[PDB]
């Protein structure tokens, strides 16, 4: 019956592919062909924060559009004031192998993880002054690659042992566990209403989970290599992935298929980060070629570059009001564009 | 009115960060690799995600990193150890896959100028086995006498023939685990590597 079940799975995959392809009557580029282009958009460096000493692996924006948190492999995590370049906090870590960081929406907690398979929570509003460790979650057998807050009580983490879990910072116990991927899960993104999230595994696929039920709903397979970044459209109806095949793609949740592909002949290096614009017209991507290419999301064409980095770009982000964009790199430098 | 105090606090924490970095710049880092049950435990004990061991020998603060617990693809986390001073390799004579691991490690993109220290252990067991069984089973192509010294030289030459970059050197020493001379070998190799790196940095090399 094993061969029969394999044949049934193959025929189900064929049916799914036929159904997905039967709904593609037209193309996005055809419909957005009669729209004036955005033109040239050159951005100039305004500020430059230089506090770290090693490669920067993650960054995040506060909900106030003023405070930012940076995590570097020197064993430290700082909190920046972007309007003044002043430093507010400096938290020493226990394990120097850090690969992720997060900022609570309320502004009271931060999170950190890495090669130690343990995710930490820090309290920033202590009565006695300094910052103390509030929790230490440990349930993963593989390196943790991403962690994103839901509220002040719960957090969702993605690990390298092909599993995703939803925790509870009050007790430190796994409420739910998501399984099904084949390789390492290296990316995560949460919906605007924080009821759904997507992840990108290393077996060249991406799935759409849901927090309440702990199940999977759809899978999008259209890439050629591993997936290292993911982000959500501001309307929460689409998400754009960035792989190591030097191509970024746009997937539609309702259409259950890809819509447009952003690539060019010259680009060879893979993509390490991806981010959208607040109104959804631009799409900035970070490249291993030390540059950042600003794309016109509705026309699949370039609109400018962001030069000024001496090494690979590791992280990029846009504020909540869309007034600024910040990038980090392996040379221990962060720049604020405008 | 009160932003000057915030500026003072920022300057103070920046100074503390600089002092911490200056203090931490002095350490020497060594990566530790090898196959499963290859005797790495014997060497680390002779003096869950990752295990770190530190000890001091002649005013030098070593740090050994063990990554044997990471049962994942090595291409996803190998860039974190790009700045290691050297790589220690252990090989069990009394036993193919080690050749593939050595080939993969030596020709990595991030390790094009990193020296490798090779340790050959279980020499006594290899001698007893060669007194009992020949060396032609493990190497069907090897031709010549069935002596211990010739077999050891052939194995070392086979291991060394996997390096192509002229800018890196491989140090080889034969161990029997009934000794405490590993620290001196590591010290000498590290001193030579440090001298070479210092000379290359200044521009006379």
């Amino acid at each position, epitope marked *: 019956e094993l061969d029969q079940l394999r044949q049934e799975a193959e025929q189900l995959k064929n049916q799914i592919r036929d159904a997905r392809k039967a709904c593609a009557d037209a193309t996005l580029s055809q419909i957005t062909n009669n729209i004036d282009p955005v033109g040239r958009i050159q951005m100039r460096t305004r500020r430059t924060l230089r506090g770290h000493l090693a490669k920067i692996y993650a960054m995040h924006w506060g909900t106030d559009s003023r405070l930012l948190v940076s995590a570097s492999q020197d064993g430290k995590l700082i909190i920046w004031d972007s309007y003044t370049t002043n430093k507010v906090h400096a938290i020493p870590l226990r394990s120097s192998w850090v690969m992720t960081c997060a900022y609570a929406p309320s502004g009271n907690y931060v999170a950190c993880g890495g090669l130690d398979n343990i995710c930490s929570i820090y309290n920033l509003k202590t009565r006695e002054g*300094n910052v103390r460790v509030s929790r230490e979650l440990a349930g993963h057998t593989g390196y943790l690659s991403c962690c994103r807050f839901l509220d002040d009580n719960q957090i969702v983490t993605s690990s390298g042992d092909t599993t995703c879990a939803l925790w509870d910072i009050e007790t430190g116990q796994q409420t739910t566990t998501f399984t099904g991927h084949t390789g390492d899960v290296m990316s995560l993104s949460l919906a605007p209403d924080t009821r759904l999230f997507v992840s990108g595994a290393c077996d060249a696929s991406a799935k759409l989970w849901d927090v309440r039920e702990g199940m999977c709903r759809q899978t999008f397979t259209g890439h050629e290599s591993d997936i290292n970044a993911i982000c959500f459209f501001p309307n929460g109806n689409a998400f754009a992935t960035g792989s190591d095949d030097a191509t970024c793609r746009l997937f539609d949740l309702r259409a259950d298929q890809e819509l447009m592909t952003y690539s060019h002949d010259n680009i060879i290096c893979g993509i390490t980060s991806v981010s959208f614009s607040k109104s959804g017209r631009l799409l900035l991507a970070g490249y291993d070629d030390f540059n950042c290419n600003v794309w016109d999301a509705l026309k699949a064409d370039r609109a400018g570059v962001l030069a000024g980095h001496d090494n690979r770009v590791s992280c990029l982000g846009v504020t909540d009001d869309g007034m600024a964009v910040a990038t980090g790199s392996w040379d221990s430098f962060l720049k604020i564009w405008n | 009115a009160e932003e000057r*105090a*915030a500026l003072e606090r920022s300057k103070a924490i920046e100074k503390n960060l600089k002092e911490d970095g200056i203090s931490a710049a002095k350490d020497v880092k060594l990566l530790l690799l090898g196959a499963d049950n290859s005797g790495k435990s014997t060497i680390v004990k002779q003096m869950t995600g990752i295990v770190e061991t530190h000890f001091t020998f002649k005013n030098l603060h070593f740090r050994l990193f063990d990554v044997g617990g990471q049962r994942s693809e090595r291409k996803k986390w190998i860039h974190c150890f790009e700045d290691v001073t050297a790589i220690i390799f252990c090989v069990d004579l009394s036993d193919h896959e080690s050749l593939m691991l050595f080939d993969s490690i030596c020709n990595n993109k991030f390790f094009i100028d990193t020296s490798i220290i090779l340790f050959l252990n279980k020499k006594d067991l290899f001698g007893e086995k060669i007194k009992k069984s020949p060396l032609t089973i493990c190497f069907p192509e090897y031709t010549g006498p069935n002596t211990y010294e010739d077999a050891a030289a052939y194995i070392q030459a086979q291991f060394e023939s996997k390096n192509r970059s002229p800018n890196k050197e491989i140090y080889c020493h034969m161990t029997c685990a009934t000794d405490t001379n590993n620290a001196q070998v590591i010290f000498d190799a590290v001193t030579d590597i440090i001298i070479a790196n210092n000379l290359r940095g200044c521009g006379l090399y």
Partner: single-chain antibody
Amino acid sequence: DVQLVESGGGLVQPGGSRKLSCSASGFAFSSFGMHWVRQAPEKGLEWVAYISSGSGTIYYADTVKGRFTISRKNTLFLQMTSLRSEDTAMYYCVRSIYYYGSSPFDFWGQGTTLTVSIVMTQATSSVPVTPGESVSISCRSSKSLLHSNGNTYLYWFLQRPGQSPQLLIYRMSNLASGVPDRFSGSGSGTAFTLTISRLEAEDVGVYYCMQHLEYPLTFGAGTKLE
């Protein structure tokens, strides 16, 4: 539990000297700034001295410069010399931390009774009030309290009878930690007011208002809601 104990006061003849101490525990003493606030037995509060975090910067009042000295183990000192008859007042120990989003003047001390042998105006000095009603107190300022960055510095304190003052509203709009939701504050430039909703028997005392723009810190006369 955060504690700040001070002692060392007593009867002194004129022309003498005395040493005051402020022992602190329960918090990171090395990352805070310390103040000194006195209150005459029949008058309002008055600023005395300030020492920054790390002894970097020190400030003194107008009528104590050259005669007092502030130093900071986990203990703070205050050396006073040439004690005249106008220094008879209890001295409090006040902590404050300064960074983006901090709340200075958080926790006050207990005070030591020492016995010796911008013009910010609060027009109203006494109001008649009964439980269950709503009361409001207002105090003005001689100079505008809005800086270029958009921040206004008005603080409101409450001193229950026989107790120490506790911070209620900082920067004219922000409610402190632990304060009930009844209190609220508003103002514009030079005229400020505070509102109390559903007054009970646990909110009876005297109120003070204070600025934090010019470091010669100045309080108000004070209003007693009896």
